[PDB]
Amino acid sequence: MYVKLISSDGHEFIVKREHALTSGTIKAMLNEVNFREIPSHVLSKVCMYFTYKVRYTNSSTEIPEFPIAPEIALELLMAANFLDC
Amino acid sequence: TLKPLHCACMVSDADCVELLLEKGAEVNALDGYNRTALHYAAEKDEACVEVLLEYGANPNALDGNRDTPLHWAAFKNNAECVRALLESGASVNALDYNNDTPLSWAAMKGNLESVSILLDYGAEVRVINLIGQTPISRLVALLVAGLGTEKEDSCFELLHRAVGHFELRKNGTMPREVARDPQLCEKLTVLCSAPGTLKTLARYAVRRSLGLQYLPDAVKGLPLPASLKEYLLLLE
Amino acid sequence: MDVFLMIRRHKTTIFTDAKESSTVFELKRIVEGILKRPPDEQRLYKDDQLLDDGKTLGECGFTSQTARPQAPATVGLAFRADDTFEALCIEPFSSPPELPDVMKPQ
Amino acid sequence: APLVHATLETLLRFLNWIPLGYIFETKLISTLIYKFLNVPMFRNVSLKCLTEIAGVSVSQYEEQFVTLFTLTMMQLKQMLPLNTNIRLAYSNGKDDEQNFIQNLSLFLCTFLKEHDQLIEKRLNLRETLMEALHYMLLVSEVEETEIFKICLEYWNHLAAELYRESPRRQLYLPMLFKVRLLMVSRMAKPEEVTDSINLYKNMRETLVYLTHLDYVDTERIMTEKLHNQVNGTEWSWKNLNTLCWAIGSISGAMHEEDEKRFLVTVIKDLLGLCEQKRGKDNKAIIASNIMYIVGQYPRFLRAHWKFLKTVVNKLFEFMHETHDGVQDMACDTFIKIAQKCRRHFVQVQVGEVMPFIDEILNNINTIICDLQPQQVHTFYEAVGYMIGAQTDQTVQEHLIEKYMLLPNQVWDSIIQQATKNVDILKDPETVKQLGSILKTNVRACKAVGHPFVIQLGRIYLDMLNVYKCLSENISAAIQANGEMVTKQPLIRSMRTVKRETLKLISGWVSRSNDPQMVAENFVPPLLDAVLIDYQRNVPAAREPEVLSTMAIIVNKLGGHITAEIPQIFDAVFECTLNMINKDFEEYPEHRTNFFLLLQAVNSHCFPAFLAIPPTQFKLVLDSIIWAFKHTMRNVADTGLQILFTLLQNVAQEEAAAQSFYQTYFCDILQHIFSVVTDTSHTAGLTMHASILAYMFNLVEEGKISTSLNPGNPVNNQIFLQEYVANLLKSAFPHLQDAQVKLFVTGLFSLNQDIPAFKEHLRDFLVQIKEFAGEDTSDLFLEEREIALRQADEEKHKRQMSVPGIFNPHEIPEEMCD
């Protein structure tokens, strides 16, 4: 029901398996996953995106913008490339 | 109405404009229709544009409706003129009285090359004019009319990659013209109902943070791999 | 209608959601189902302010507009150890690297 | 000086007839220019004189022509430098200067049109030639209609010459661009949005030739002008209108792919312009221009289904516009598109679930809610074309049933009301509605064709009923208030209803396919409703269409209606004959329809004449004789044709042929000879020769089988010879007996060769005319008008081979799919 993702700095994020499978890499690789290059401040945003994508899939109303700060945009893009998101 | 330099620009002869400028001609002089010689040069040829720019011509000169020469170069689809103007300091997001940017005019007619160059120089796709139109909306209006070809489809793909996510539905219904086309309506509803991949949104954020630059040069200095550098430039 | 929460404790983070009308007891039940701790040895904090278990989640500071899927509302968590409650400890996420010169505002 | 001017004018008057020796051999060709042309007083006429010389078109004397051109060009350069603005000079110039400019244009045009090849083969004069062309461009800027017509004549000639050869084009290449601009800049108004028609046709032909010479240049010019319209510079309603007329008039000249590119760019620019402009006036102007553009180029609409659907939907939108003229233009464009792209509305297109015709039919009531009655008729005709494009019979039947639903229900309501109370047929609103419904039915029948029998049979019996009622209403009114009551609006509304009924019947029957069904089902009720009503009405109340209708039926049913002909004649013939023969300007339509019916009966149902009573047959012959003795050309021609066909037909009725000969041969021969000798119908001379040659041949072969002499037997040949000789002598007593005898013998011998017979008769008549002071030119009219016709044919055959010269909707050679 729940999967646990470990950040490079040791932070642990527990998310619903359905949300986690949004990432092709996670689905292919999987009750726990570990990343050696994704920092916590990026993995938290990735989990936020999992929730946001699951909520607003096939929505009939306007989908609100996903907030990405310029500081993490580069690392977030790299992480999204590593995953399949 | 118009002055000899304007006529030289209209007839598209670099020699005449160059020799006229060689005797201190008023390069930024207005005329009967409130345009400048650079407007005609942008509308006509890139050699005249280069000659005029070499002699201090203002690349952001305004006309009766506050349209810069870049607006007309993009509308005419003079890709070389667009590149020459942008390379000399032209504003890529200049707004006219209707709040129409050059990219909006380029997308109105589905000009692929001009759109590509404007995006390469940091043009904003998430822009709306006074009557609520956006470049993607205008391109879709062109497409639903049946006047589009493979070039227009490629332009739509480019704009879709550049925008990240778009919404054409007012309230919860597509416009009347789109709604009456079962195929394009289905395609656009499927596109508009998807939140958007994280990679696309991150690319949009990175590009926006780079705004108003020659993006292919800027991305060269980033620590990204080659594949992500190509991705950031809408090449995939 | 629905409020999205990010329960936090030390390095552990749980992304979840609940109805605004739901009570804190159900949230503690979810925390049990995740970390396997009795609710009697759990206590939740909203901005270093203790939350009474009886209060419904809506009447607290959590609201649908404030807590969205793309911006969940943090909820600190504390367990009971040796017949005592530990101090609320939340480990901040790693700081992002300095913005490169090219990406800085003009 | 006045004596010199008078002498020059007299020379100009007589210059045409003077032998070329006195013109091109003397010193005149230089005296006129070095002695008078420099002097304004004798300038104009002098220049005019030169023009006449340039028009001689003599094979020899090349050096004289070259010297004339060179010296005249130098003189004109001296007295009118090429740097001048001819437009302003003509505008503000006095009468003398305007006349001089006109004469200069005339001289240049005529001399170039005559000897351009002569002038341009000299390498030394090349520059001067271009100079001349410059003048022709300069003068072409004058706004006056006559000067521009003169210039356009030469421009059209040059364009046709250059196109024909494919070179020589390289000689005119560096300047043709200018001409193109002119053609696009001064384009005339097409008769889709006399002197004006000719001007537009000439401009279109010249522009089509020029675009055929260079597609890229034409596309560049038009696109640049359209952009200039878009960017504000040189924007104006008239400029936009002329540019769009020029774009439309090119349709068909370009290849399909180049046309595709050009039209896509033009449409995008026009849509951008429409978005840019604000205000109802500007938007309406742009919409009308786009409507005209898309009205042409049916090929592009055919190749692009989505754009065609969008255009049709936009036309439906415009149909609700209250702005003046927008609805008419929308309906015209819709009918054009429906005619040229009919098959694309009935078949299912790519990406569609059902054909567009179903969608149009479902929403028909909503589309035409704001249209005027004539616009509604046009819309129904346009839809009928598409419905008729449907090949499958059952689907077409269902389409027709849905097509006439609203008219059918209004008609049914009116019919039920009339059944409840007949007086409703006297209500003006009801009569007007019936007329409108019948007009819609007529247009639908015209568009659909034979399958419309499904609709016609639905209402036929009711229609003929209403007809009768309305007739009964009119006859009463005339009986109560006299014939003047026929001017009343209600009476003419009822007569309009009757006319539309007859027009619908005729329109369907003319396109019928099964004569037996028409004869069995439709003819009897029609005759019962129409015949006696026509007979008993006063001349001011009789409908001419009746006669026309009858003719149509007789042409389609033929032997299937030969049994009814006697009653048709009994009801119509004597009445219309008394109506028509009385005066030659009273009832033109009645006379035309009467002779059409007579011709149809004679051609297809001749045996009926045998069953007709002899007195009525005599009336028929008297009508024919009155017809071919008339003064008008058409009446005489139709009378002669009917007489010839009647003679040929009666030649096949052995039982009655002898009686017909013995009763009418001499009378017909005498009438024909009288009209021939009177020379009142020279245009029909050939026909006379066709008839007489036949008649004589009948006695030549002994086919008369009886003596034409009423008193005693005698050989028919000798009797006819003496009779015709006596006729000629009475007509021309002064002629000698031997001359008449030899002429008649030769004429009788040539009965087996129509051309020789006609030439002999023509020679005799020419000699007769020359004996007096009469002119023999008229006798040869039959020749000249033929030659003219031939020329026209050639012209037409020349223009069909050049794509784009003819309007896409004018060519009957519709393509497939």
Ligand SMILES: *[C@H](CC(=O)NNc1cnccn1)n1cnc(-c2cc(C(F)(F)F)cc(C(F)(F)F)c2)n1
């Ligand atoms: C004004 C401009 C307008 O209403 N819409 N602009 C568009 C439409 N579609 C795509 C892009 N921009 N305006 C005035 N008249 C027209 C118009 C007329 C016709 C005609 F054929 F009926 F004359 C057709 C169309 C078209 F292209 F089918 F939409 C537009 N537009």
